[PDB]
Amino acid sequence: NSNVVTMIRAGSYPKVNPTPTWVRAIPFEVSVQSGIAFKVPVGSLFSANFRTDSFTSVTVMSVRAWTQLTPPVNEYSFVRLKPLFKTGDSTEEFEGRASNINTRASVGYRIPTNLRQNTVAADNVCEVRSNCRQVALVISCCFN
Amino acid sequence: NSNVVTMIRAGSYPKVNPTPTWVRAIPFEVSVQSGIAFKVPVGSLFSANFRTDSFTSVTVMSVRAWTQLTPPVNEYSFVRLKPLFKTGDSTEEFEGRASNINTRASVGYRIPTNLRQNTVAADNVCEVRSNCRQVALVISCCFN
Amino acid sequence: NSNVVTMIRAGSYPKVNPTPTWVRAIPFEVSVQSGIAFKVPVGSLFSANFRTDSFTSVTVMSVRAWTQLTPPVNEYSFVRLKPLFKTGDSTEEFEGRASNINTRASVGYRIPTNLRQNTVAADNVCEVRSNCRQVALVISCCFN
Amino acid sequence: NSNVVTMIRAGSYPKVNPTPTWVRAIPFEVSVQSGIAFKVPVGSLFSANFRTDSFTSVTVMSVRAWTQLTPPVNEYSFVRLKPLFKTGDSTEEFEGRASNINTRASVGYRIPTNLRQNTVAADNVCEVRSNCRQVALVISCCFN
Amino acid sequence: NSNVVTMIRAGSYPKVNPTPTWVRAIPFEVSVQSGIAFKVPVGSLFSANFRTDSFTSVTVMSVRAWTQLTPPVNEYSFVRLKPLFKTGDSTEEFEGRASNINTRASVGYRIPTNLRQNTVAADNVCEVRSNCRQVALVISCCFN
Amino acid sequence: NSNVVTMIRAGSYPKVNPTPTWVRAIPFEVSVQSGIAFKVPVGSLFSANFRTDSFTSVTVMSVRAWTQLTPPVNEYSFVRLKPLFKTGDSTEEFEGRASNINTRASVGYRIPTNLRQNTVAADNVCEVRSNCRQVALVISCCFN
Amino acid sequence: NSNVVTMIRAGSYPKVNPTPTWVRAIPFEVSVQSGIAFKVPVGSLFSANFRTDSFTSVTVMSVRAWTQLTPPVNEYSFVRLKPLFKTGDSTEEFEGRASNINTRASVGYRIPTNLRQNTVAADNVCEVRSNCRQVALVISCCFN
RNA sequence: AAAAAAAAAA
RNA sequence: AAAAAAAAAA
RNA sequence: AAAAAAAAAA
RNA sequence: AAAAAAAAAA
RNA sequence: AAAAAAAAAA
RNA sequence: AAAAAAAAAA
RNA sequence: AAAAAAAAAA
RNA sequence: AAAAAAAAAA
RNA sequence: AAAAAAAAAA
RNA sequence: AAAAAAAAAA
RNA sequence: AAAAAAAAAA
RNA sequence: AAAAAAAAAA
RNA sequence: AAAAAAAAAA
RNA sequence: AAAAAAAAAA
């Protein structure tokens, strides 16, 4: 291959965009109480910690959740997700349970194309229920 | 295709990275004086205006330059690029000229693999000369 | 085939969901006045009569309508449907007419993928007009 | 694909059913005492928690069971299932044991076609034995 | 081919619609001031000048823009487009620049299927920025 | 498919037309006396009710007619169409009759290419005769 | 194709005929009394209402008949045709009956080649019988 | 499956 | 015969 | 797709 | 042999 | 079926 | 390469 | 894709 | 059409 | 050449 | 997919 | 990749 | 191996 | 030779 | 015979 700088024969000025979209997998944790649902706010996805603080909207594609701390004594971990939407909340309760007490439970759901509109910081993604005090989420989304 | 949320059968917690790399084409302008070379600082690529203020290093891959304002009366636009590098500056003067007084002049150079190390805000990309008072740059780079 | 119970060699505890989605064709009637349009509420679709009282949202896919009573003397039955949407109402008036006075008139419309968002009880599906005093609807939808 | 509503050329009024059947996998737990068998009532499957409170009969196809709490000290989890039938109870004791003390034990059984009649709330599905204080069941059935 | 009127053997009365949908490319102009973004209202698309005054909703599919007057002295024309959405505004700034001072600058963007819902007169399509005092827009859209 | 807005690399300003042509099937009704021909005016086709009030000309391609009310006692419906043209009226009498007293009569005629000139609101399409007091027309035409 | 008049290189004066033959399907109605046969006169086919008043002879090829008014209460329509010929009358009674009280009855017969001689106004085609007071006839014939 | 009108593309 | 939902399986 | 009547053509 | 108009057919 | 002049096209 | 108009030809 | 100048190689 | 980054899949 | 909307057809 | 035990069949 | 339930379709 | 976003190429 | 129940296997 | 740098070309 080349070992020196070489000339590019550029032409006209291209179409440009200083502030493009970005397809991402955002990891973050939320704290949960026993037997009480926690609504996950979209605003959690806008943070300098993720290089995403310059965005104001995001299109969520899929949501996956793991338990992040150990469960109560005698119990296996579990986590439930209930999808939420601005045009109408769901009542599905997708649930995963561990089969080894020392292991995370996990579950996720995919959002269909007809429901992939933008959300803003004030919106919510889903409700989380778990017998563990922390749940780790990984959300796949397109920032725009 | 599906019209409702569906279950994902997630497994172990994956490898994650909250602060990933980003391949970009960054557009910005600089002011140049007649007969005086202008050193383009790498720090210009780190700005909230480009969603890149969270990075501190970047690997520049190629530089393209267009004249941005009209040339002096009776002349055609021209722009020159001289590559700069921390381990040793170049003396090439890649030059483009307009063939129509009303049109931009353009030129670019590609940086070879063996010279694609990181730069930081205090470093310089290249020297620009032009008979126009502004030059528009589009730099292809990998933020990391 | 087997005539007795046989063992299943079950494995880890699976992903579960106690409240799944349901793809349905719901049949109900509405009362129509002459010359006056009737707005069909989405809330009609949530009812123990359909096994759907546990849902709060629904994604409507297609609407079909039939006249359910005889037309006025000398007339042939007709029915019109005007689609309604929360992001903006349509002005189409899909219309079916009977070619035999003793026969139902019918018409339907399909909602495109890009408009299949959720609707809740307070929302409306469409407007119905008819010269018959009742209209029977069958709505294809996904409860979620 | 289409971006707007389009007409459907509906025909005669179709055959309809407002209360269809539903093929389901229902997950619930039961409390078990040491040394004592627990009869699992069919009535557990009818509940608003499963969107099934509108059904009065169900045809059970297969039963699967997992231990839901940790076993006694020094022991590995186990669970046994004895199938029950209105025309005559079985004496099989399908049994699963854990090979890791921290792991659920599991077992299931399939009901043959010739024994898939309806069962109502007063009937029983099976007997459960376990050295763990709770057992999680998933039952595959057709509500009708 | 035939030179006279001939008979059609028509059948039963068909499904009809007196107010159908219309796929269109609407051309119009907006006035913009330097350094100020102009929000383009959807209501611009409803006008007798386009035969569209009888619609109240539209699904926007793509937006293209051109500069419509000459740029300031010594400058090349430019135009930026920032998409707007009811469910959440974007921060992209799609930009095109002229390479001959006597030529229009142009740029455009396409709206994805998941974001093609309806918009009414009070909604906005996008923000426009330019150094030219007028910008010509051509919007591909579906009136319904 | 794509889930976010993407750039279009627009070129030169295209050819545009804010007021285009429209191929339509227009349904309307006319009142008829027994034994008396009714001349159907072309102006019926220009109406806000059809989104056509901005057109002043139209090219009729085909005419189809149905009886719209029940026939006199003891009779079967019938309907006759006689084409009219500015350059010379026809004397054809295309006729349809019902074979069931409860059923619409219908007939149609196609206009040949050499006769597809423009007509204006003061022109006439055809003559209608029927033993029913109302006739329903569906005209296929091109508005220009 | 050509858009202007063009020359024909005509030759010798051709064979001509100002009064050609005409294959036609003539529709007309006759009045019938209960229990009485009606002889259909051939003269009914020579009329300005059919553009045939310039013919004095006709060759009848086939005869079809429909009932034209409702039958008496409780009865289904029927119609009978008995062919008549100048060289000798038939005694067949081709009959058709309705299977729905509201629909027309119909029947017809074909005249074989050996019997297709000319007929004039004073001749008869056939005898009609019917329990309906009017019968509609369509006769396929060659005017010469 | 072919065609006309409007839209969009390689 | 293809595709979407819930269930079951090699 | 075949046949009759009228028209036109290689 | 191909086409238009009227008629008839599988 | 080939060619020239004017027009129009993929 | 196909077509229209004028011309010319086997 | 072919050629010249400089460099490197099987 | 090939390659790099992020995302997603059999 | 493929697709959407309106129209027409075997 | 092959085999042993019990059952059943062309 | 095959089969059962509810939905939709050529 | 197929797809989306950003980049680059024939 | 195909199938059901129990057992054993690549 | 393949490649890099500079030049020139279809």
Ligand SMILES: [Mg+2]
């Ligand atoms: Mg009937």
